[PDB]
Amino acid sequence: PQITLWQRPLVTIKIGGQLKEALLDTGADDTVLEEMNLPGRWKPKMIGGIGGFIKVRQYDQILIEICGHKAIGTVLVGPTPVNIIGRNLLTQIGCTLNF
Amino acid sequence: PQITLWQRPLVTIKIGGQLKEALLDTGADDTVLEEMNLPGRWKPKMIGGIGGFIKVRQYDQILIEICGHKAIGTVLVGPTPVNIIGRNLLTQIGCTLNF
Ligand SMILES: CC(C)CN(C[C@@H](O)[C@H](Cc1ccccc1)NC(=O)O[C@H]1CO[C@H]2OCC[C@H]21)S(=O)(=O)c1ccc(N)cc1
């Protein structure tokens, strides 16, 4: 659907059989989720934001359903304060900014 | 215009007579710019992201032109690694997410 930005653009996501809320985040290159068990192989990685950097686990080719749209991509897991859906997955669900 | 997300959604802004590049950032509540002279009164403030917090100067009722759309609102100035246009200004230029 189309969404305005008067409130945080939070959507429901389903990943690893679990239901979560996550922020559609055009300022995030990558998707980063708070601590959870994703099954399979991962690689250590560091991502930076405002305030500095966090260590994350990088999981590749993970299936996520974002507000009813399925995407398969890289998910990072670590101590982000908020679940964020980044451009790597936004592109797959055909998400655009409009003004 | 309409903007896809294969690349960072970077736009030209004009603020305090200066031309800068800034990221349209639906994951940011606030607009935060890197160090610059904004004229007038400010207040100390702290904002948090991934990796922790930064101290910023809060300037109210600042005029910004974002990709040719004028907005007046709060601008935060501080050691963000990237100029980010947040929802406080995105709403004023009628910016929407669609998928
Ligand atoms: C994490 C969000 C809930 C909030 N952040 C906005 C977010 O878009 C930042 C915006 C951002 C962009 C660049 C550098 C720092 C912060 N992106 C970000 O942290 O993304 C990380 C995930 O992938 C990587 O892509 C870029 C940074 C990494 S934030 O920068 O911390 C932020 C917080 C509060 C305000 N008022 C403004 C911005």
β-strand A43-49 against A96-98: which pairing, if any?
unpaired
Catalogue the E-assigned strands of A1-99: 2-3, 10-15, 18-24, 31-33, 43-49, 52-66, 69-77, 84-85, 96-98
**Torsion angles phi and psi, residue A46, rounded to 5:** -125, 130
**Contact flag B25-A25 (C-beta cutoff 8 Å):** yes
**Torsion angles phi and psi, residue A93, rounded to 5:** -100, 5
Nearest to A14 by CA among A40, A33, A29: A33
Distance, in angstroms, between B96 CA and closest chain A CA?
5
Lookup result for tokens 């996550």: A22
Resolution value, angstrom units: 2.0
Domain A1-99, CATH among 2.170.190.11, 3.40.50.720, 3.30.43.10, 2.40.70.10 = 2.40.70.10
Nearest to A76 by CA among A37, A40, A30, A39: A30
| C-alpha count within 13 angstroms, C-beta hemisphere, residue A8 | 15
A&B contacts, CB < 8 Å: 134
Residue A3 neighbours by CB under 8 Å, 6+ apart: A9, A24, B96, B97, B98
The token pair that represents B41 in the structure block: 């009164």
**How distant is the alpha carbon of residue B85 from its chain centre?**
3
Nearest to B27 by CA among B2, B46, B54, B8: B8
Burial of residue B14, with CB atoms counted within 10 A of its CB: 0-12 exposed, 13-18 middle, 19 or more buried: middle
Helix, strand, or coil (residue A27):
coil
CA B21/CA B84 separation, integer angstroms: 9
Query: Method of determination?
Result: X-ray
**Contact flag B96-A97 (C-beta cutoff 8 Å):** yes
Task: Give distance in angstroms: CA of B25 to centre of ligand 1.
Answer: 8
CA B52/CA B37 separation, integer angstroms: 25
Between the alpha carbon of residue B89 and those of residues A7, A24, B83, the distances in Å are 12, 17, 13
Residue nearest to atom 2 of ligand 1 (CA): B27
The token pair that represents B12 in the structure block: 């030209």
DSSP classification of residue B51: T
The token pair that represents B99 in the structure block: 């998928």
The token pair that represents A25 in the structure block: 């985040």
Given a contact cutoff of 8 angstroms between Cβ atoms, the answer to whether B73 and B91 are in contact is: no
CA A15/CA A67 separation, integer angstroms: 11
**Contact flag B48-A48 (C-beta cutoff 8 Å):** no
Please choose from A50, A74, A84, A97 the residue to mutate so as to test ligand 1's pocket, defined by most ligand atoms within 8 A of CB: A50
Contacts of A64 in chain B (CB under 8 A): none
Helix, strand, or coil (residue A22):
strand
CA A84/CA B1 separation, integer angstroms: 24
Catalytic annotation on B60? no
Burial of residue B10, with CB atoms counted within 10 A of its CB: 0-12 exposed, 13-18 middle, 19 or more buried: middle
The token pair that represents B63 in the structure block: 């005029």
